[PDB]
Amino acid sequence: RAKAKTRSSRAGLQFPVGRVHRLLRKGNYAERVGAGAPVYLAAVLEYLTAEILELAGNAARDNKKTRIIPRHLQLAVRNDEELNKLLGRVTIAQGGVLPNIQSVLLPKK
Amino acid sequence: RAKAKTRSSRAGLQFPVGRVHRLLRKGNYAERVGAGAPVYLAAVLEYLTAEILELAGNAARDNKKTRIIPRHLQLAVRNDEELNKLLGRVTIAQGGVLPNIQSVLLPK
Amino acid sequence: HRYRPGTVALREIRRYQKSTELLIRKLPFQRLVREIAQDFKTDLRFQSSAVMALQEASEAYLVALFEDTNLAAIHAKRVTIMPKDIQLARRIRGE
Amino acid sequence: HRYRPGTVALREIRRYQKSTELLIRKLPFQRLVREIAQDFKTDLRFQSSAVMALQEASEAYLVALFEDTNLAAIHAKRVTIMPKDIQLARRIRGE
Amino acid sequence: AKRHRKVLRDNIQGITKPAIRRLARRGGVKRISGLIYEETRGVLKVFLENVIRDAVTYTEHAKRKTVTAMDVVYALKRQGRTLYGFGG
Amino acid sequence: AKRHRKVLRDNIQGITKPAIRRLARRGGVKRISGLIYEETRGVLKVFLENVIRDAVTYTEHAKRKTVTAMDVVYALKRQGRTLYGFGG
Amino acid sequence: YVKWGKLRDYQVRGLNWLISLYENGINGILADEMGLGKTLQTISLLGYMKHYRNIPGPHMVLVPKSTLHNWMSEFKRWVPTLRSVCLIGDKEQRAAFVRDVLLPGEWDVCVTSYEMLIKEKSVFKKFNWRYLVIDEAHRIKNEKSKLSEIVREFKTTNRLLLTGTPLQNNLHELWSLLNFLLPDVFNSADDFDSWFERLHMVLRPFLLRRIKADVEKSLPPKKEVKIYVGLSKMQREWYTRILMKDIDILNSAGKMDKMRLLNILMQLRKCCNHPYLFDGAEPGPPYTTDMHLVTNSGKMVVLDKLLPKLKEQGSRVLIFSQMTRVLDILEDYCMWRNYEYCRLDGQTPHDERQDSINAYNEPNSTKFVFMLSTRAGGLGINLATADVVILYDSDWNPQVDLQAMDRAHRIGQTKTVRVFRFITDNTVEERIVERAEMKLRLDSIVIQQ
Amino acid sequence: YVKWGKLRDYQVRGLNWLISLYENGINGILADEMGLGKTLQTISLLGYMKHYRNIPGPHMVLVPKSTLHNWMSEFKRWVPTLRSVCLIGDKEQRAAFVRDVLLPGEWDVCVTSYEMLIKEKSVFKKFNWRYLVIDEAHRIKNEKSKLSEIVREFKTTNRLLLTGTPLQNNLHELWSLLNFLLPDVFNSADDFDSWFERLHMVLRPFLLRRIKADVEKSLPPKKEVKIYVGLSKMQREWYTRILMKDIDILNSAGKMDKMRLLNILMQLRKCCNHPYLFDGAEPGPPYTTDMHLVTNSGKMVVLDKLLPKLKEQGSRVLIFSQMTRVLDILEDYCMWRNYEYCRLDGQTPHDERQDSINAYNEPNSTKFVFMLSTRAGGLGINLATADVVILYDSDWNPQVDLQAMDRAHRIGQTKTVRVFRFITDNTVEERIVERAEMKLRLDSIVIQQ
Amino acid sequence: RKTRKESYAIYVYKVLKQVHPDTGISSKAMSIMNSFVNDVFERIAGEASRLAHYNKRSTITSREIQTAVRLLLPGELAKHAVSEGTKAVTKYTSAK
Amino acid sequence: RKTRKESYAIYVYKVLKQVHPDTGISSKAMSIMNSFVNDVFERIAGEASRLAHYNKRSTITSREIQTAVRLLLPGELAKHAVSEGTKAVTKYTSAK
DNA sequence: CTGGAGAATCCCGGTGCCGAGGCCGCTCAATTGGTCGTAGACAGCTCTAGCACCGCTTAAACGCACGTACGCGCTGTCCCCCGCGTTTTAACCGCCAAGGGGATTACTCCCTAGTCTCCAGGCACGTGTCAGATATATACATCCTGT
DNA sequence: ACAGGATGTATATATCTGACACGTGCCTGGAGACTAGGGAGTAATCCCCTTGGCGGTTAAAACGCGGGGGACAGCGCGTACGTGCGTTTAAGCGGTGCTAGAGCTGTCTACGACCAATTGAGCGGCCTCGGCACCGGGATTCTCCAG
Ligand SMILES: Nc1ncnc2c1ncn2[C@@H]1O[C@H](COP(=O)(O)OP(=O)(O)O)[C@@H](O)[C@H]1O
Ligand SMILES: Nc1ncnc2c1ncn2[C@@H]1O[C@H](COP(=O)(O)OP(=O)(O)O)[C@@H](O)[C@H]1O
Ligand SMILES: [Mg+2]
Ligand SMILES: [Mg+2]
Would you kindly state where each structural domain of chain J is located, as residue ranges?
1-95
Provide the 10 A C-beta neighbour count for residue H312: 10
> Cβ distance H393 to H197 under 8 Å?
no
Quote the CA–CA distance of A25 and A19 in Å, as a whole number: 10
CATH number of the domain bearing residue F35: 1.10.20.10
Q: Which residues of B touch J53 (CB under 8 A)?
A: 27-28
Discontinuities in chain A with C to N beyond 2.5 Å fall right after none
**Chain A interface with B: residues with Cβ < 8 Å:** 28-31
Nearest nucleotide from residue J1 CA, by C1' atom: K124
Asked whether D75 and C83 are in contact (CB, 8 A), the reply is no
H176: Cα within 13 Å, side-chain hemisphere? 21
Number of domains in chain F: 1
Residue H57, ligand 2, Cβ within 6 A:
no
Q: Is the CB of H5 under 6 A from ligand 2?
A: yes
H99 DSSP 8-state letter: I
Query: Residue H229's beta-bridge partner residues?
Result: H424
Where are the alpha helices (H) located in chain F, listed in sequence order? 17-26, 36-61, 69-78
Mark the nucleotides of strand K covered by protein, meaning any atom under 7 Å from a CB: 6-9, 15-21, 28-33, 39-40, 49-62, 68-72, 80-84, 90-92, 94-105, 111-113, 118-125, 131-132, 136, 143-145
- Mark out chain E residues that contact chain J at CB-CB < 8 A: 54, 57-58, 60-62, 70, 74, 78
Closest residue by Cα to residue G82 from G115, G118, G107, G111: G107
**Size of chain D, expressed as the number of residues it contains:** 95
How far separated are the first and last CA of chain G, in Å rounded? 27
Dihedral sign computed on CA atoms, order J28, J29, J32, J33: negative
Q: Which of C13, C56, C79 sits opposite B93 (nearest CB)?
A: C56
Euclidean distance between CA atoms H241 and J34, whole angstroms:
49
Q: Count of CB atoms within 10 A of residue C85's CB?
A: 25
Q: Is B67 exposed, middle or buried (0-12, 13-18, 19+ CB in 10 A)?
A: exposed
DSSP three-state, residue G236: helix
Taking every pair of Cα atoms in chain F, the longest distance, rounded to a whole number of angstroms, is 53
Q: What contacts 24+ positions apart, CB below 8 Å, involve C60-66?
A: C60/B91, C61/E47, C61/E81, C62/E23, C62/E27, C62/E40, C62/E43, C62/E44, C63/B97, C63/E23, C63/E26, C63/E27, C64/E27, C65/C89, C65/C90, C65/E27, C65/E43, C66/E23, C66/E24, C66/E26, C66/E27, C66/E28, C66/E29
Task: Give the span between the Cα atoms of I6 and I17, in whole angstroms.
Answer: 21
Residues of E within 8 A of G329 (CB-CB) are 2-3
Residue A103: which of C82, D73, D74, F32 has the closest Cα?
D74
| Nearest partner of B15 among G192, I16, H180, A56, judged by Cα | I16
Nearest-CA residue for atom 1 of ligand 2: H7
Q: E73 to chain I: nearest residue by CA?
A: I35
What residues contact residue C77 under an 8 Å CB cut-off, 6+ apart?
A: D76
Q: CB–CB of G213/G221 below 8 Å?
A: yes
- How many whole angstroms separate alpha carbon G69 and alpha carbon G65? 9
Residues of D in contact with H251 (CB under 8 A): none
* C1' of K96 to CA of G431 (Å): 19
Number of other CB atoms surrounding residue G5 within 10 Å? 9
Determine the Cα–Cα distance for residues H134 and H159; give it in Å rounded to an integer: 8
- Beta-strand runs (E) in H136-206: 156-162
Is there a contact between J22 and A60 (Cβ–Cβ < 8 Å)? no
**What's the CATH number for G9-215?**
3.40.50.10810
Q: Count Cβ atoms below 10 Å from residue H310 Cβ, excluding itself.
A: 16
Q: Is H146 annotated as a binding residue?
A: no
Fold designation for H223-230+289-443: Rossmann fold (3.40.50)
Q: How far is J87 from chain E (nearest CA, A)?
A: 20
- Per DSSP, the three-state class of G63 is strand
What one-character DSSP code corresponds to residue G66?
Answer: G
Task: Answer whether E15's CB lies under 8 Å from C19's CB.
Answer: no
Which residues pair with residue E4 across a beta bridge? none
- In this structure, which residues have their CB less than 5 angstroms from ion ligand 4? H 380
Are H383 and H360 in contact by the 8 Å Cβ rule? The answer is yes
Please report, to the nearest 10 degrees, the dihedral formed by the alpha carbons of residues I21, I24, I28, I30 taken in order: 30
* B50 touches E: beta carbon within 8 Å: no
Helix (H) or strand (E) segment spanning residue G30: strand G29-30
Q: Using the CB atoms, write b or e for H398-413: b if 16+ within 10 Å.
A: bbbbbbbbbbbbbeeb
Cα dihedral value H53, H54, H58, H63, nearest 10: 50
d(CA H80, CA H3): 8
Taking the C-alpha atoms of residue H183 and residue H175, their distance in angstroms, rounded to an integer, is 10
Look at residues E61, F82, E73 and name the one whose alpha carbon lies nearest to residue J48: E61
CA G15/CA G51 separation, integer angstroms:
14
For residue H161, the CA-to-ligand 4 centroid distance in Å is 12
Interior angle at CA J22, CA J19 and CA J25, nearest 5:
80
CA B34 to chain centre: 24
Ligand nearest to the CA of G66: 3
- Dist. CA H101–CA H353, nearest whole Å: 25
Spatial CA neighbour of G112 closest among G126, G96, G142, G132: G132
| Domain segments of chain G as ranges | 9-215, 223-230+289-443
Protein-to-nucleotide distance from the CA of E7 to the C1' of K88, whole angstroms: 14
User: Looking at the 3D structure of chain A, how many domains does it have?
Assistant: 1
Are the C-beta atoms of I31 and B68 separated by less than 8 Å? no
Interatomic CA distance for residues F87 and G175, integer angstroms: 78
> How far off is chain C from D57, nearest CA to CA, in Å?
19
- Alpha carbon distance G190, G202 (integer Å): 15
The secondary structure of B26-86 as a DSSP string is: TTTS-SEE-TTHHHHHHHHHHHHHHHHHHHHHHHHHHTT-SEE-HHHHHHHHHHSHHHHHH
What DSSP letter does each residue of G193-215 carry, written as one string? HHH----STTHHHHEE---HHHH
Distance CA G4, CA G80 (A): 9
What is the resolution in angstroms? Answer: 2.8
Residues whose CB is less than 8 angstroms from the CB of residue A73 and which lie 6 or more positions away in sequence, other chains included: A52, A56, A59, A92, A95, J29, J32, J33
For ligand 1, atom 16, name the residue with the nearest CA.
G37
Q: Residue A43 sits in which domain range?
A: 1-109
The subunits that touch chain G, with at least 3 C-beta pairs less than 8 Å apart, are C, E
Short-list H255, H376, H385, H235, CA closest to H300: H235
Beta strands in I1-96 (DSSP E): 24-25, 59-60
Nucleotide L13 C1' to residue H47 CA (A): 43
Q: Beta carbon of C31 within 7 Å of strand K?
A: no
d(CA H32, CA H18): 13
Q: What count of residues does chain F have?
A: 88
Grouping H, G, I as helix, E, B as strand and the rest as coil, residue H158 is strand
Listed in sequence order, the residues at least 6 apart from J16 whose beta carbon sits closer than 8 Å to its beta carbon are A53, A57, A68, J23, J25
Of D5, E67, H137, G137, give the one whose Cα is nearest residue C52: E67
Per CATH, G9-215 and G223-230+289-443 having the same topology is answered: yes
Please say whether the dihedral angle defined by the alpha carbons of residues G88, G92, G93 and G94, taken in this order, is positive or negative: positive
Residue nearest to atom 4 of ligand 1 (CA): G5
Give the integer Cα–Cα distance in Å for A77 and A87: 8
- Please give the distance, rounded to the nearest whole angstrom, from the Cα atom of residue G112 to the centre of ligand 1: 20
CA of D43 to the centre of ligand 1 (A): 107
Give me the residue from F26, F30, F85 closest to A97, CB to CB: F26
Distance CA G269, CA G432 (A): 10
User: What is the 8-class DSSP label of residue H100?
Assistant: I
Fold classified for D1-95:
Histone, subunit A (1.10.20)
Beta carbons of B37 and I61 less than 8 angstroms apart: yes
Give the helix/strand (H/E) hosting C93: helix C83-93
Give exposure, B1-31, as e/b (b: 16+ Cβ within 10 Å): eeeeeebbebbebbbbbeebbebbeebbbbe
Look up the domain containing E31 and give its range.
Answer: 1-86
Do I35 and E84 meet the contact criterion of CB atoms below 8 Å apart? Answer: yes
CB atoms within 10 A of CB H293: 21
Residue D87 burial (CB < 10 Å; 0-12/13-18/19+)?
middle
**Domain spanning I1-95: CATH 1.10.20.10:** yes
Residues with CB under 5 A from ligand 3 (ion): G 380
The span from the CA of H7 to the CA of G400, in Å, is 143
| CA gap G120, A35 in Å, rounded | 70
Cross-strand partners of G220: none
Alpha-carbon span A77 to A58, nearest angstrom: 12
Chains F and H are in contact, defined as 3 or more C-beta pairs closer than 8 angstroms: yes
Amino acid at the residue G103: L
Interface contact flag, E85 I38, Cβ < 8 Å: no
**DSSP characters over I50-76:** HHHHHTT-SEE-HHHHHHHHHHHS-HH
Q: Which long-range contacts (CB under 8 A, 24 or more apart) does F59-66 make?
A: F59/D41, F59/D44, F60/D41, F60/I67, F61/I51, F61/I55, F61/I63, F61/I64, F61/I67, F62/I54, F62/I55, F65/D43, F65/D44, F65/D45, F66/D44, F66/D45, F66/D46, F66/D47
**Separation in Å: K63 C1' and D30 CA:** 26
Give the CATH number of domain H9-213: 3.40.50.10810
Integer angstrom CA distances of residue E22 from B70, C20, E19, E29, E31: 21, 12, 5, 9, 11
Nearest-Cα distance to chain C for D84, in Å, is 9
Pairing of strands H369-373, H341-344: parallel
Query: For residue F68, what is the DSSP state?
Result: P
Residue H86: strand pairing partners:
H111
CA-to-C1' span, D1 to L6 (A): 8
SS3 H128: coil
DSSP F3: G
| SS3 label, residue H64 | coil
Task: With residue H229 as reference, give the H or E element that holds it.
Answer: strand H223-229
Q: Is I2 exposed, middle or buried (0-12, 13-18, 19+ CB in 10 A)?
A: exposed
Instruction: Give the span between the Cα atoms of G379 and G138, in whole angstroms.
Output: 11
Distance (Å, whole) CA J54 – CA C65: 31
Neighbour-count burial for J69-89, b at 16+ CB within 10 Å, e otherwise: bbbbbeeebbebbbebbeebb
> In Å, what is the CA distance from C8 to each residue of B69, G288, J93?
29, 48, 71
Q: How was this structure determined?
A: cryo-EM
Task: Look at strands H369-373 and H59-63 and give their pairing.
Answer: unpaired
